[PDB]
Design a protein around this ligand. Structure first.
Ligand SMILES: [Zn+2]
Lengths: 49, 336, 65, 112, 43
């Protein structure tokens, strides 16, 4: 697969509800432990995802 | 199933000067290199039939490279798999860890996950081509993957069936949309005619719900196959003949259309009942003639393709010897 | 990389094959726009404030043919 | 039965712009100038020079050691293989009305 | 609000370059001229 060349023609602004946040987000923060070892703690706010 | 689809995409051209020398050939080559053998827009691309439309080889404004881009709309052959499709050849790469899964060995690549919940699934062994039916869940065509992903179980003909009620008489000028499909089934039946009748009989009696060794063969010029049981001594009608009756424009479409488990699935015959003479496992579905006829035609096409693929892939008696244990699973499950 | 179907930023990686859109899932149509990391950060900041930004990619144009 | 409202995602209500059709104005009906503007000549030369850097095949008989000179002499000698598209209008019906101009048959401005 | 991308500020804030000056007019390749004068690399 390849991503063809494209340009932005317009921008639409809207109020983002919780549904948009749930759909767009790639993970859910559950713990307050920032770091586990050198690598970021999984489920924290620095999760590599 | 195999179908014609139209996509439209944008192709980046690294050397526009060389690309434009033979635009059609270069565009076809690029489309084949990029899209053939990958899942795109909920469809698996098999080959590129042609380029319906295209645009001039523009030059990228935003970047300072001389590279160009071309909007191309192309018609290709794609494979879409619905629910309940039957896949004759499925090799089990790894039946272990209470999870099962196998890869299709047909023109439409698929990765099917078989649950360990069912005992029949656990019985199957690795390196064994086991026929499989996809579950009711839709097939997941992740873009960019070279094979579709689905969940299925070893095909065990189920006794429960459904009855369809037609409230609208035959749709007029939609008989042509149905004829598009009768053509596909005709091609499938012509293909089935070539192979030997004995292997077809073997597989039909293996997958016939009510196994019959009587060797009695219902003979229809398009279709020949061993006969089954008779319910209420009722007379089924060939779907192809009723569709041909479109010239008459009268087809008695209202009557309940149903195919009992006894009635061979590959056979075009289906029973028409004025009332709910067929036992209704579920309340007869209130559907139009379009929905029903398309449904019955799809089911028969699925079963005919299943049978042709079964005959082709098990063309060796020794492979059948290995898979007789799978056959025993099906036979043990079969009741009558 | 922006998904044409939904106009939202998407996930595309060529070396490691990734062609994914969180919103559309299947039916994703990724297109590569040229931009600046500053503009990306600006859009991410605006989204953080619960202002959804949808980018309408320029339409494809074909010869009459 | 009172009905509550749950706001759908914005993406669901978004419909992408439909594909357009390129409407090329006939040669005799063009109304834009037949003399390349300085911007258009500069863009043509720059694009041709970049493509020469990509692919070195050139029609010019004389030999030069720089892509810029090759592109300049191609424009001046009317051998440049590029075309100029002037987008006039984008109608709501889904048409892109444009004018296609051939640099080799156009007037060239004073670039020096 | 729906904001079309025109002028200088709007493309600039979106990371793109304004479509004016040298980028006002599109440049497309002359397929007819090339197919009669140039030869494919493979050919
Ligand atoms: Zn999307």
């Amino acid at each position: 697969m390849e991503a063809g060349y494209a340009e932005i023609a317009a921008v639409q602004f809207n109020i983002a509800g919780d549904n948009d946040h749930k759909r767009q987000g790639v993970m859910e923060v559950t713990i307050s432990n920032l770091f586990e070892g050198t690598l970021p703690a999984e489920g924290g706010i620095y999760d590599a995802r | 199933m195999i179908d014609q689809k139209i996509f439209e995409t944008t192709l980046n051209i690294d050397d526009p000067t060389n690309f434009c020398t033979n635009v059609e050939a270069h565009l076809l080559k690029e489309l084949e290199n990029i899209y053939v053998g990958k899942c795109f827009k909920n469809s698996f691309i098999l080959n590129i039939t042609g380029v319906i439309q295209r645009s001039p080889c523009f030059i990228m404004r935003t970047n300072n490279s001389g590279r160009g881009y071309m909007h191309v709309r192309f018609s290709a052959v794609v494979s879409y798999l619905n629910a309940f499709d039957l896949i004759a050849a499925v090799k089990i790469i790894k039946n272990d860890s209470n999870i099962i899964l196998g890869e299709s060995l047909l023109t439409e690549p698929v990765t099917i996950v078989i649950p360990s919940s069912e005992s029949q699934n656990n019985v199957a062994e690795v390196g064994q081509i086991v026929p499989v039916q996809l579950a009711n869940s839709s097939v997941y065509y992740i873009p960019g993957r070279q094979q579709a992903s689905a969940t299925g179980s070893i095909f065990i003909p189920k006794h429960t069936f459904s009855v369809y009620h037609v409230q609208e008489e035959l749709t007029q000028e939609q008989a042509l949309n149905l004829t598009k499909l009768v053509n596909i089934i005709e091609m499938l039946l012509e293909s089935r005619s070539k192979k030997d009748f004995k292997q077809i009989c073997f597989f039909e009696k293996l997958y016939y719900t009510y196994s019959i060794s009587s060797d009695e063969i219902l003979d229809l010029k398009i279709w020949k196959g061993p006969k089954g049981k008779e319910m209420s001594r009722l007379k089924p009608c060939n779907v192809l003949s009723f569709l041909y009756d479109a010239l008459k424009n009268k087809s008695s479409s209202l009557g309940f259309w149903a195919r009992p488990p006894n009635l061979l699935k590959s056979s075009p015959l289906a029973y028409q009942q004025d009332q709910n003479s067929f036992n209704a496992t579920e309340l007869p579905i209130i559907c139009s003639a379009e929905v029903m006829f398309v449904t019955l035609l799809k089911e028969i096409i699925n079963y005919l393709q299943f049978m042709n693929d079964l005959c082709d892939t098990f063309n060796n008696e020794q492979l059948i010897k290995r898979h007789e244990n799978i056959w025993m699973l099906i036979e043990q499950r079969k009741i009558g | 990389y922006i998904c044409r179907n939904c106009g939202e930023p998407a996930i595309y990686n060529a070396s490691h094959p990734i062609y994914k859109c969180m919103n559309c899932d299947v039916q994703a149509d990724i297109g590569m726009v040229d931009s600046r990391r500053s503009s990306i950060v600006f859009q991410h900041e605006m989204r953080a404030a619960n202002v959804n930004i949808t980018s309408v990619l320029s339409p494809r144009v074909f010869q009459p043919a | 039965k009172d009905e509550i409202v749950e706001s759908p995602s914005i993406c669901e209500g978004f419909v992408q712009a439909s594909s357009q059709t390129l409407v090329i104005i006939p040669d005799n009906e063009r109304i834009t100038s037949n003399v390349l503007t300085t911007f258009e000549a500069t863009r043509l030369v720059a694009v041709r020079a970049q493509q020469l850097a990509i692919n070195g095949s050139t029609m010019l008989k004389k030999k030069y050691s720089s892509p810029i000179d090759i592109a300049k002499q191609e424009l001046f000698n009317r051998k440049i293989p590029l075309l100029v598209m002037r987008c006039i209008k984008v109608t709501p019906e889904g048409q892109k009305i444009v004018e296609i101009w051939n640099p080799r048959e156009m007037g060239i401005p004073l670039l020096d | 609000a729906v904001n079309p991308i025109y002028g200088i500020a709007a493309p600039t804030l979106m990371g793109s370059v304004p479509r004016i000056g040298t980028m006002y007019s599109d440049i497309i390749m002359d397929e007819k001229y090339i197919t009669e004068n140039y030869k494919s690399v493979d050919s």
